[PDB]
Amino acid sequence: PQITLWKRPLVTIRIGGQLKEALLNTGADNTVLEEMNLPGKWKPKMIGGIGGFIKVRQYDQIPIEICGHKAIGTVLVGPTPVNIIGRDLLTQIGCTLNF
Amino acid sequence: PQITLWKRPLVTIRIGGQLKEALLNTGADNTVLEEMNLPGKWKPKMIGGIGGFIKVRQYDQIPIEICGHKAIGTVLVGPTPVNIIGRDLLTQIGCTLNF
């Protein structure tokens, strides 16, 4: 559909059978979730935001459903204040910014 | 336009007669620019996200052109890593998220 930006663009996602709220975030290169357990191999990464840098774990080829859309891709996990769907998965689901 | 998210959504802005580049950020409540001199009264504020908080200056009723569309609103100024157009002004220029 079409999502207004008068309020934060929060949507339900589903990952590993858990329901979570995340923010559709054109200002994020990547998808970053609050601390959680995921299966398999991972690698540590440092990402930057508004106030400095945080450490995350990078997991690849994780299935995630984002407002009804099946996606499979990389998920970074760490101390983000809010779950973020970044450009890597917005593109996957066909999301554009229109004005 | 309908902007795709293959690349960071960096666009032309014009503020106080200066040409800059800014990131259209649906993950930001408010607009924050790198340090610059703007006219008029300001108030200090803190804004936060990944990596913690920074101290900014808040100016009101500032004209800014974003990708050709005129806006007038509240502009924060401070140590952000990139000029950021937030929802406050994305709404003004008619932005929605579409998928």
């Binding site: 290169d29 990547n30 440092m46 990402i47 508004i50 | 996200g49 990944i50 952000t80």
Partner: peptide
């Protein structure tokens, strides 16, 4: 609450 979720890849 924080309000600016800029995020840059590694």
């Amino acid at each position: 609450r924080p309000g600016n979720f800029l995020q840059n890849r590694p």
